[PDB]
Amino acid sequence: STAGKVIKCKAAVLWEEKKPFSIEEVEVAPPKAHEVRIKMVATGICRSDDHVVSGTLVTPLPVIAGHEAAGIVESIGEGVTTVRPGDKVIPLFTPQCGKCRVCKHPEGNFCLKNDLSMPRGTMQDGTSRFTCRGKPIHHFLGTSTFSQYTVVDEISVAKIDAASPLEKVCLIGCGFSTGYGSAVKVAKVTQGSTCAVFGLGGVGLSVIMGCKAAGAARIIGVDINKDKFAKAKEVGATECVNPQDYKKPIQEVLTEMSNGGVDFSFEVIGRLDTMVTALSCCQEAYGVSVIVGVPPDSQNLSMNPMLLLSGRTWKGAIFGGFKSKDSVPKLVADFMAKKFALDPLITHVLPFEKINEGFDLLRSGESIRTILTF
Amino acid sequence: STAGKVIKCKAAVLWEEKKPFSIEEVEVAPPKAHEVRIKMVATGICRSDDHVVSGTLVTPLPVIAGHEAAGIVESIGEGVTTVRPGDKVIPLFTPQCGKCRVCKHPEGNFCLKNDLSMPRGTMQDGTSRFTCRGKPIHHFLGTSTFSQYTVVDEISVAKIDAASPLEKVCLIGCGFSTGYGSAVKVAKVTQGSTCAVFGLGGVGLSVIMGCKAAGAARIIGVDINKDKFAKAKEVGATECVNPQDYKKPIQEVLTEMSNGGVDFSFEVIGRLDTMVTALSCCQEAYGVSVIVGVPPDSQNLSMNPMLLLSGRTWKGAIFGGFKSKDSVPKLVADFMAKKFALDPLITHVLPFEKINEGFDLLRSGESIRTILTF
Numbered sequence: 001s002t003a004g005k006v007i008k009c010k011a012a013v014l015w016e017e018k019k020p021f022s023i024e025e026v027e028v029a030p031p032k033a034h035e036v037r038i039k040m041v042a043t044g045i046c047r048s049d050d051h052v053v054s055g056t057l058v059t060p061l062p063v064i065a066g067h068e069a070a071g072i073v074e075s076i077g078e079g080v081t082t083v084r085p086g087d088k089v090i091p092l093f094t095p096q097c098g099k100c101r102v103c104k105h106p107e108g109n110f111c112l113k114n115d116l117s118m119p120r121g122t123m124q125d126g127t128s129r130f131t132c133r134g135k136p137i138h139h140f141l142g143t144s145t146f147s148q149y150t151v152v153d154e155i156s157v158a159k160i161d162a163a164s165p166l167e168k169v170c171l172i173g174c175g176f177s178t179g180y181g182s183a184v185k186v187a188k189v190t191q192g193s194t195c196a197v198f199g200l201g202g203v204g205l206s207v208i209m210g211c212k213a214a215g216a217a218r219i220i221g222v223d224i225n226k227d228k229f230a231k232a233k234e235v236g237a238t239e240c241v242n243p244q245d246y247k248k249p250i251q252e253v254l255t256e257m258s259n260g261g262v263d264f265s266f267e268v269i270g271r272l273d274t275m276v277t278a279l280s281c282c283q284e285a286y287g288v289s290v291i292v293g294v295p296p297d298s299q300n301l302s303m304n305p306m307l308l309l310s311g312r313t314w315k316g317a318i319f320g321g322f323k324s325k326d327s328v329p330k331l332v333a334d335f336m337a338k339k340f341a342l343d344p345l346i347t348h349v350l351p352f353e354k355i356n357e358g359f360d361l362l363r364s365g366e367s368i369r370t371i372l373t374f
Numbered sequence: 375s376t377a378g379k380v381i382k383c384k385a386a387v388l389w390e391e392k393k394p395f396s397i398e399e400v401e402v403a404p405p406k407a408h409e410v411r412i413k414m415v416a417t418g419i420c421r422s423d424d425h426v427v428s429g430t431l432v433t434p435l436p437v438i439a440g441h442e443a444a445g446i447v448e449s450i451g452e453g454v455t456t457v458r459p460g461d462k463v464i465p466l467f468t469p470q471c472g473k474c475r476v477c478k479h480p481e482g483n484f485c486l487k488n489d490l491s492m493p494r495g496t497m498q499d500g501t502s503r504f505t506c507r508g509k510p511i512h513h514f515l516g517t518s519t520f521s522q523y524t525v526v527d528e529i530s531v532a533k534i535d536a537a538s539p540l541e542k543v544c545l546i547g548c549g550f551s552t553g554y555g556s557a558v559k560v561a562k563v564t565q566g567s568t569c570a571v572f573g574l575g576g577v578g579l580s581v582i583m584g585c586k587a588a589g590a591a592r593i594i595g596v597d598i599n600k601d602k603f604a605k606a607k608e609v610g611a612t613e614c615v616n617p618q619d620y621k622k623p624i625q626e627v628l629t630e631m632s633n634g635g636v637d638f639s640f641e642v643i644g645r646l647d648t649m650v651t652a653l654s655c656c657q658e659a660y661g662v663s664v665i666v667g668v669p670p671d672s673q674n675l676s677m678n679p680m681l682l683l684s685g686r687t688w689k690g691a692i693f694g695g696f697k698s699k700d701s702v703p704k705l706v707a708d709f710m711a712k713k714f715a716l717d718p719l720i721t722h723v724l725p726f727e728k729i730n731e732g733f734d735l736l737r738s739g740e741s742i743r744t745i746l747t748f
């Protein structure tokens with residue numbers, strides 16, 4: 001009934017940094033060639049969405065944020081072959097064009113069509129599908145999931161199992177897949193190893209899940225909010241430490257606890273100082289540290305390269321290193337087969353209309369993931 | 375006969391930074407339990423030795439430096455089982471104790487018994503075997519090869535082929551093995567890949583050799599001294615670039631040349647700025663950059679962690695990642711079997727008495743390796 005027509009719907013528009021989202025009517029254009037218009041069903045609140053609010057992440061405003069979601073295809077533009085109306089889908093904030101040198105590489109996932117490195121806030125064609133109060137509104141990461149309807153490029157959507165519970169599998173669109181893949185694919189955590197995970201939010205919990213799945217013998221959670229420790233232990237942490245409890249810097253504490261440094265460490269917060277701490281705490285000759293947290297815009301860290309010269313490996317990744325369109329349907333299939341759990345990440349459920357309360361819950365430290373339902 | 379006796383011999387003593395070596399008589403104590411006294415045959419001049427002179431590397435003075443060498447066992451202490459008098463040997467500036475967590479790790483080589491991190495300038499027992507003009511003289515990296523005779527711990531010496539030409543295979547004690555291993559073992563250069571090598575001295579040329587042995591399709595040498603380019607091309611560089619020739623930063627030049635970034639880059643100079651450039655010039659999603667150079671003591675670099683978040687891997691290594699005592703004899707056997715060449719690294723051969731002249735050749739840009747002969 002809406003194919004080829006502008007849809008008026010509600011969205012959460014961010015007009016200004018450091019302000020509440022405005023739930024109000026937007027106009028969503030129909031999909032152009034190789035575009036897909038999706039009726040959203042569920043979207044998670046990831047800390048990266050909050051970064052847009054805080055200005056930690058710089059992207060053009062005004063914007064419709066949201067990148068962790070699942071929905072149902074309402075219509076497809078000309079030439080779309082990989083989804084159809086009625087299919088369940090997850091938007092892909094890291095696209096998979098399948099054609100660029102990264103998509104062709106066996107270990108690349110950061111497709112060159114991404115809108116993360118130097119955000120334009122548009123569709124692939126450099127234009128917007130969103131109007132609000134007669135003004136064009138930016139997209140975010142090609143996804144813009146804080147809307148009852150969004151339009152995405154075909155390279156930014158994956159078809160998933162028709163029997164998927166969308167209020168759970170939305171987390172495969174960011175936080176679960178990122179954390180789990182950062183452990184199993186990026187770090188390649190080994191059986192019997194010792195891991196340290198800095199930050200015990202939805203992504204860090206997912207890192208612990210992966211480290212446990214990989215067979216780590218010790219998984220040390222690190223957070224300044226000790227209310228995060230119980231859930232971290234439930235999903236596999238063997239012990240948790242709060243840096244505020246110690247006179248000494250936590251890299252020295254973790255090096256002592258691990259009899260000379262950990263095998264694998266993960267920065268899952270977004271602070272320059274914890275990125276250097278996390279590198280330092282892995283064993284100097286053969287340790288690996290993975291940056292997962294999003295750093296504040298345009299700020300440089302300072303570090304002594306002797307940390308690397310001794311043998312450490314330092315790497316980072318977007319979306320757990322997963323090639324997004326290949327991996328998301330497989331991850332949903334594995335979830336359907338109970339290969340991993342998503343419920344431990346979901347602490348709150350709210351209607352979309354209570355998005356601001358959802359952000360309040362994240363900022364207070366109370367929530368892991370709030371799932372918004374449309 | 376010298377066994378069990380103090381030897382009076384010639385050595386190059388560094389009494390203070392930024393002064394010439396003093397070629398004079400030292401006394402060399404006999405080896406204690408688990409120690410080996412070696413008559414030196416040949417030693418190379420590595421830039422790391424010059425870093426001790428310049429203050430780039432801090433190590434206790436006065437000192438007998440030198441770490442790239444080969445010689446013949448004069449005598450062994452009680453309990454030595456791995457060499458005998460008359461054996462050809464290479465001292466190991468990275469030891470292999472065989473017992474520490476690093477030595478037991480499949481990918482570790484930076485043995486915890488090393489004297490690099492926190493140099494004491496002693497034998498493993500915290501004492502010195504050297505005196506000069508009645509004063510105790512420090513060891514350097516457990517090796518101290520700028521002497522007619524040295525004493526090393528057993529864990530810091532490898533027995534090599536009795537038919538080895540010691541005036542060539544001394545380079546397996548540092549520069550060849552470091553560069554070659556940085557490419558083949560630490561980076562794991564792939565067939566058909568594009569490499570960039572920053573610094574075309576003895577170590578950087580050995581990195582080129584390894585990149586070519588690994589089947590790289592393109593190997594771009596980078597040096598501010600264009601006199602270094604002809605030999606770089608002889609051993610496998612396909613292109614050479616001088617940053618001073620460009621209005622743009624060389625990371626931009628190399629990204630353009632490689633149609634979006636190199637597969638593998640190597641910092642083989644010792645400058646903070648080139649370490650960040652080398653990381654930047656590798657492809658942002660799947661590139662690997664290896665730090666080989668040694669920069670000025672206690673200086674931090676500045677970098678934007680977004681370089682890592684996109685997917686880059688940044689690592690460093692000592693001695694090409696090789697477990698020293700297992701690897702050095704195999705590298706010498708492979709040299710004897712013509713699997714690689716060492717002559718391209720050797721530009722000058724001088725008597726040991728001309729050590730200062732050999733350092734002046736390095737500092738002036740003329741030489742790659744000077745081999746000093748005893």
Ligand SMILES: NC(=O)c1ccc[n+]([C@@H]2O[C@H](COP(=O)([O-])OP(=O)([O-])OC[C@H]3O[C@@H](n4cnc5c(N)[nH+]cnc54)[C@H](O)[C@@H]3O)[C@@H](O)[C@H]2O)c1
Pocket residue numbers: 046047048051174175178198199200201202203204222223224225228243268269270271274291292293294295317318319320368683
């Ligand atoms: N690389 C990616 O693809 C990717 C994906 C998803 C999220 N992110 C980022 O990952 C980070 C974590 O996201 P999330 O789990 O949704 O966030 P979150 O739920 O806010 O969790 C962060 C955790 O860090 C804790 N923390 C804060 N400061 C410190 C400190 N100084 N020391 C130790 N713990 C501290 C904090 O208490 C909280 O539990 C954010 O920076 C995201 O932007 C990156």
Ligand SMILES: NC(=O)c1ccc[n+]([C@@H]2O[C@H](COP(=O)([O-])OP(=O)([O-])OC[C@H]3O[C@@H](n4cnc5c(N)[nH+]cnc54)[C@H](O)[C@@H]3O)[C@@H](O)[C@H]2O)c1
Pocket residue numbers: 309419420421422425548549552572573574575576577578596597598599602617642643644645648665666667668669691692693694741742
């Ligand atoms: N990691 C290890 O185990 C290890 C082993 C051996 C050597 N090293 C270090 O590796 C480095 C190279 O040693 P080497 O090959 O004996 O030294 P070298 O022979 O002096 O070569 C260094 C090269 O760098 C070139 N260079 C200098 N500045 C620049 C610049 N700004 N841009 C590009 N090129 C430049 C210079 O012209 C020269 O050709 C030194 O810092 C050594 O201390 C490390």
Ligand SMILES: OCc1c(F)c(F)c(F)c(F)c1F
Pocket residue numbers: 046047048049057067093116141174294318319683
């Ligand atoms: O949470 C996933 C996520 C990221 F990892 C980013 F690096 C980023 F810029 C962003 F906008 C994002 F949403």
Ligand SMILES: OCc1c(F)c(F)c(F)c(F)c1F
Pocket residue numbers: 309420421422423431441467490515548668692693
């Ligand atoms: O050239 C090898 C070498 C190094 F790689 C160092 F890191 C160091 F401190 C040193 F003294 C040395 F000789």
Ligand SMILES: [Zn+2]
Pocket residue numbers: 095096097098099100101102103111112113
């Ligand atoms: Zn692509």
Ligand SMILES: [Zn+2]
Pocket residue numbers: 046047048049067068174175
């Ligand atoms: Zn996210």
Ligand SMILES: [Zn+2]
Pocket residue numbers: 469470471472473474475476477485486487
């Ligand atoms: Zn050891």
Ligand SMILES: [Zn+2]
Pocket residue numbers: 420421422423441442548549
């Ligand atoms: Zn050296």
